[PDB]
Design a protein around this nucleic acid. Sequence first.
RNA 1: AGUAGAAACAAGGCC
RNA 2: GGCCUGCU
Lengths: 718, 25, 511, 737
Amino acid sequence: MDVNPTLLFLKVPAQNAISTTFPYTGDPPYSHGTGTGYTMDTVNRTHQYSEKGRWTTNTETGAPQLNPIDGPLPEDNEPSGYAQTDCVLEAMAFLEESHPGIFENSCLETMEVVQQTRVDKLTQGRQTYDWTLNRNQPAATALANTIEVFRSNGLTANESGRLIDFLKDVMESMDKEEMEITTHFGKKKQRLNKRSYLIRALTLNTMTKDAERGKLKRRAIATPGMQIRGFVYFVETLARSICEKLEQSGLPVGGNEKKAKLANVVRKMMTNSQDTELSFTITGDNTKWNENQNPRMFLAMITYITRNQPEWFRNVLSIAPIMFSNKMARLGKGYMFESKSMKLRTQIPAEMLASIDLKYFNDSTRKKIEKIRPLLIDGTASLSPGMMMGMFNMLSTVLGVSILNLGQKRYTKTTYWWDGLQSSDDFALIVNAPNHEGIQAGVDRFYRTCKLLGINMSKKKSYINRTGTFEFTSFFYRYGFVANFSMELPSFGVSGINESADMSIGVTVIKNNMINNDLGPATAQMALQLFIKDYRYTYRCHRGDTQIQTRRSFEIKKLWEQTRSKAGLLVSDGGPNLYNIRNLHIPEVCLKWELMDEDYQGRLCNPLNPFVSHKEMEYDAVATTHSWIPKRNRSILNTSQRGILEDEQMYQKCCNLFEKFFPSSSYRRPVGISSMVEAMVSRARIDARIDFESGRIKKEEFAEIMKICSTIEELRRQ
Amino acid sequence: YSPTSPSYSPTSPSYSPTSPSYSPT
Amino acid sequence: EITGTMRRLADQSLPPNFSSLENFRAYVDGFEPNGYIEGKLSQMSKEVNARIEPFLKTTPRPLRLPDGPPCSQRSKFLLMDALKLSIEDPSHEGEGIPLYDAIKCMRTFFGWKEPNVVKPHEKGINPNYLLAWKQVLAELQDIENEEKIPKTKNMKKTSQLKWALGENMAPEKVDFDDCKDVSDLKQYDSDEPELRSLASWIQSEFNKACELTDSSWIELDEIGEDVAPIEHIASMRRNYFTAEVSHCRATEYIMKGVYINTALLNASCAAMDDFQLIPMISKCRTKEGRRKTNLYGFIIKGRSHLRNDTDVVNFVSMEFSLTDPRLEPHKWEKYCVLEIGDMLLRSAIGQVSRPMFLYVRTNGTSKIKMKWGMEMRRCLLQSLQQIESMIEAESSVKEKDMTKEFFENKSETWPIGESPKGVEEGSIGKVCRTLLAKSVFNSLYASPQLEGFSAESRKLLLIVQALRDNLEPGTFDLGGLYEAIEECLINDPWVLLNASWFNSFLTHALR
Amino acid sequence: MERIKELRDLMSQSRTREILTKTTVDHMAIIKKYTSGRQEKNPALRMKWMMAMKYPITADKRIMEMIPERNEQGQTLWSKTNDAGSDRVMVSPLAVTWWNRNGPTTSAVHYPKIYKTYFEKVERLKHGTFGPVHFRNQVKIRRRVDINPGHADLSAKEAQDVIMEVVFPNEVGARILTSESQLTITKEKKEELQDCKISPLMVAYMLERELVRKTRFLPVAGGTSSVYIEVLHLTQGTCWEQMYTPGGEVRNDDVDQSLIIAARNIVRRATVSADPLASLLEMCHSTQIGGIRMVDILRQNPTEEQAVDICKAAMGLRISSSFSFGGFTFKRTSGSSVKREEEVLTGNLQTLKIRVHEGYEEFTMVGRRATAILRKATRRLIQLIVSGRDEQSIAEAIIVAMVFSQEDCMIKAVRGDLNFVNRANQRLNPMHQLLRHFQKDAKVLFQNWGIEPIDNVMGMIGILPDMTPSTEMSMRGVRVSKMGVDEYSSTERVVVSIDRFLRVRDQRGNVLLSPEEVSETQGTEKLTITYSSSMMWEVNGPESVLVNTYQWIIRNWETVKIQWSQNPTMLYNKMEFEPFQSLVPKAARGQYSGFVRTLFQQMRDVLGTFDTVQIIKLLPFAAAPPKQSRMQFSSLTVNVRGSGMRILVRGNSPVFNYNKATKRLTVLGKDAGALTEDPDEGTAGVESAVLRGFLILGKEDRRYGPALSINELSNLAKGEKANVLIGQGDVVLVMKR
RNA sequence: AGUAGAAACAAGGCC
RNA sequence: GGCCUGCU
């Protein structure tokens, strides 16, 4: 017998045993080098789905740009980026008519948000490209550098603390005659003329995407600069506000709410239909979603949403698509060469691709360079006619929801009609009709309308079958959603934060999978045992009874011997495991409280210990000595950016002192626009005053503190 | 519970190729 | 407000026929729907359509497997041909010094001969492999003669290990200013992987990786005492599962992989500049409960200055085996088999005296492959969750637990495997073992091709299932789906085997 | 004081002064998060690869002086090398374990207070009681629930303001609390923290966690009470299910909500039942909620609800009054009335006989989501005021009042097929059928009622047919209002009769309840509904064989209690314990028998020891022939579904639990008789029938050493006291004989 | 050689 | 040979 797992589907319906076909147990494919081979391909393809568009030449950045909007209607099924503005506005207007007052309320909420938001919100972000070093720096570091340069160069309106003030600074910067920065290499002053700074503000940094499941070919993902971050934030806020009010938009909610919405839609469509009507669920998928959402359509949507709103709000919302329409996509790391005969290798920056000869490359990269060269300007390529990756998923989902709404049988004016649920890049459409040709006509109408709006259905990944069985972004549905457990498999291992955090996170993951993904009792117990085994093997915290020999075993054994109630030690200190199917919701240290020795209990959770980091998926945690934090890579030391570490040290010292002065700074972010020294001195003076008025402080101490504050103020004023 | 695969062939193979005996034991 | 450069950019970010942002806003504000969509639909070409092509029992066709030289083994350790020099030892899991355990196991087989090559590498310097094995054996003798056994042993940097582990191989890094006129300067070779065809050995390996052994390869720790009745039912069912899965050989492969990757990671994170010597070890309980420790072979980690999570640490892997390479030579393409000894095993006939072989090869693994090999124990979770789902689904219909009769009565069986007589049914135990073996092989032979094929074939599998449920499926472009699926099958043995299984399933289904 | 000294020292330098002066308070967040080290993309890989190195942990500088350089063996615990961008030094986990085994001690007595939510969770779990596990399909509907067991009913922003005021009085800012409830909770918290030595940040975090309410989307089916949702992973499965009763704040609100929903469901099912009275009685006697039986709560908690009152009356206990109509609760307050047995026609020309009432009368309507007050006369409405919450609530109240008025303006509005027969072919009440017809929409009743003038007194708002207030002309008699509550809560529970089809009646002859009033809404229970019914004993399940056996010995306790003492061998060799013995496995029958007989014998020997539960529990195991033995048992297995249900010698179990409050015994979720109070019950804390050759003197004491275990007690000897851990993790003292 | 697959590793920077 | 880095 030749065992054949796939033959199991002759009996088990595919949906039920669908977890078998998810190879999520092996290392995901990882990009092994430079993302400059995929970025050029993305640029070329984006310019190839819109070549019939209207070329032009931007008069500020001085780079060619493509304008496909209102282009010739597509004549073949191939992807087309020729969105029609009239059709987009019709979709939006019908969406507003079907949902009266959606845009007005969304604009009100966003006006409140934009008037209220602070500059600190830009720190809560992932890697961003900071335009002052031409590298990728964390969000906070990039924001700090940008604010430093703005203050140095005369822009200071962001000191008010509101985000919109920083945006005003950003806009006023682009008009500055010549910016200058003081980057190190002892430091030099590099001056950027108007055009250079403008091109650097609009530039996008592109890096290859890593750890992608379900694709054979690597993609490219881009991260926006720091000037475009705030406008994108406001636009995303508006789009989320709009989507939260749409029953057919699944993007702004979690998995379970997606399940609820999709089940509701299926029940509404299939059940309400009479016996004679047919039904058909299209589990489709859009192809080249990003390479066709032209930002000018986003500007049209933003202008139609913000009708009858204050001009300032309209402008601050519209600035984002205006900046994205002129974006330049920084190529990337640049290719690398080798010499088999001479036995050496060289690295060429991506900047010199415009000037380097084509005698080095392959037969494909040579064509890619030959085709991308016209668009290059100062080491970056114009990428006007498309997006790079998301950054507007909410608004794109709004567009998808509008096109889904456009077939409510009030706009179809025909027997057939459709609806469904839209999540950016993924849709499920449910057609109805009185005969099969009706379904055919409905599908054709939907496809053509989507093509007009500039979004293409993928015909090689979509099938239409009688309602019931269907799929949606990996939530398979067979007369009721079936839980596939292979998607959440990667979460079971030790997360890797620290000991207590790892224990809490693992037990919480097991509990959640028992709740949602229908993990059985016995399987939950085996997952618990395997997690404990992995956790012990990773943290060297074996049970103590064992004769394991490791770098940490000696004093784990010593502590085990010392203790009296050995059944109370934390699993991190070699204690027994006491979890089961009924204790998964109780944090470990709270679980063994009754069984703990007084001495060990006191030593364990001692605030004086130097390991707790004063805190930092929602995993229920308890402060304990096992909450230490891991080190950092320390790889900067070799580079020329050694001085940044001194900046970090000084900033931490100052912020710790401020924390000392203002107790609430740690809990709630400190607001205000008074310099730090002035705030500290004022607080000290008022504290001394109130203490002397009624308290411990006496006249001598009051005089000493007041004179110290006076000399501090004198030192400040110098 | 002791697993018992009908294709067991516990006497079919003269010796397990991977885990033999070699040693006098 | 918007002024200056921002306004001059905004005036250039409008549909083609508009000139200024203010005019565009005035147009949009005065916009009112007047049947533009319905007017452009008719104007659009009628060639743009979404014709539904019905999917019928005859529509699907077998996948087009590639053609080329047969594929060869690529796993980091021999799976089917893995000898074990064992010695009874009352120790658990990690107890004991691996070097001492390895030398003790080596001191049990007395048939060592003078090694010689019996299947050269066809691309290497095989004498180097022979000298590497000689050096490893001499080094084991050396450590044995010493008073104390060091925790880890660093091999001497000789020419043989230097070549086998690829030292000084990397071209020297240089700036482009001077290395510009070099005649042979090119771009790094980046071409499609060489095509290779499906061999017969992978099916046999997957067959052997589902049988029930006579040992216990996994021994899990205790769990909190059970109180609630659910805990008792779960404990009974878990006893069943851990009995039906601890004896599978796929679990032996799991433990081998976990140990090898853990040892390699720990050794490469500490001795980043010396050639260590990491013997392979695995421990199990015999049928009578006696503990054992096993020794498959040895690993010799090379210089391992890993920076990115894709770099390569070369380790020459020396493994014992009893299978003569001159039976499936197309499978041992990258090894350098040697003949080291002559065992005298006892069988149903008694003494047989087969020769023993050493499968030496170079190899490499990155810092991400090592992590995902250390995390290989999730295969058990995947397979057991599937089995639990099936058992609970059946037991829901009949208001009582069904696990006992499922595992013992040899009750309702599932179609697993394919024999000349047709499809052969298998009990729930064999289904569990087969799913576990599938997960283990997914972990061992992971690659991009597997991901792409898995997705593009799940699509077609769902289409076929919809057909088999009389749901009247329909596809817009099936040929494109088939072309996407066939693009993933290039040279990976596991992906080719999966495609073969899918063809067999399509044959049996729809018929 | 030292704060300003440190500030002066810091500003003394140039770079520190520059950063101090240039940066404003707003940029503090940016400066705090300013760091070069980026976040980990793959935390698991980095952690697995980091613990291999030496010194993979960073600790404050104080480690330098608080922990030695090396431990006893000589393994470095910390290294003077500094971290990347901080003064923190690098240490190895050896340092953490060295702290744990040798670090400075402390009094952690305040730790339970700071983390009070988690310890309250453990407290609930420890005192919880389990029940039988049922295999049955679960309709896992997805809805939003509350995951915080003790949410204090505050928004996130309001909770943050309360925390800041409580822990940071000066930093509260411009915000001032408004709701009196906020002030009350603030005072309650402030009184209990008048002197707390833990850091303010920890107190603030604790208050935030235990005040803010959290909601998550879960696939729950049965429960939704925050206490039940906490253990959702234990009482809900794809096919299996379990009854769980959390050991916590059995709040009257949750109990009464569960009672109301259970009453609704039982009434709805009884409506279709062939014999609703008998079936309802048996099912009420055959079900419980939250571990407490329905009868106990019903006789205990007074709760006004149509279904609840129906259950109360069904048992024959004291029953309420204040007749109800259309799901609303009417209380007359003036006037007499007599029926007339008259005949009339409709607008659809259908003829019908009805009973119209006499006299002028006022009524006090009550309901679930509305309220009203009515004055009327014979066939004629006089006035109607309404107090609904939503507009459709006022519409419901108004249509109910119009139907109650019996006016011809309503009779000449009935249009369509309204057949007064039920699914069971039972003629239906006319009033309820009209009231159900006018609940789709009562447009015709509005355009056919009439119009009158108004004095425009009080500035009252006008009525709406279809949302059109008319402040000078309006419906006749009908008014608009919005009270807070009805006149008063009624004061009299009446006596009643019931027909077979559950048509409740009063002493006079009027109608009081019916299966058509049971609102209809399908709510979700808070506490698990132990709707025992199909959950049964087949024709003879354990709920039969076993559950029943215990019931027999309960009923015959009066002669078993004295046969147990004199001639007990004729009680064990009895024809009633033979079906039980077929379940005990054949290998462990005589061992159990010898064990139990020695238990009972030494329970007879020493005086002052008598527990009726032990005798009632362990007798079916002493039936068998006795095989002697030397070992001991913590439980006793009985084969129920090829599964060994364990009956615990010491204490209660999910299979055998005796409530000490209501004195009921409970087998497998089925009542098995009330148990009576023997005056010779030794209430001395001693238990002579748990261990074989040992007594149990009481609770633990730390003098006689650590807790020995059950299977290591033969080491002891004569008179050797000791400690033993047995039962559900409980330590006790024992003494040999 | 080897890992690996549309581009890389098979050590890198500085004195 | 010495220093420094193992996501910069």
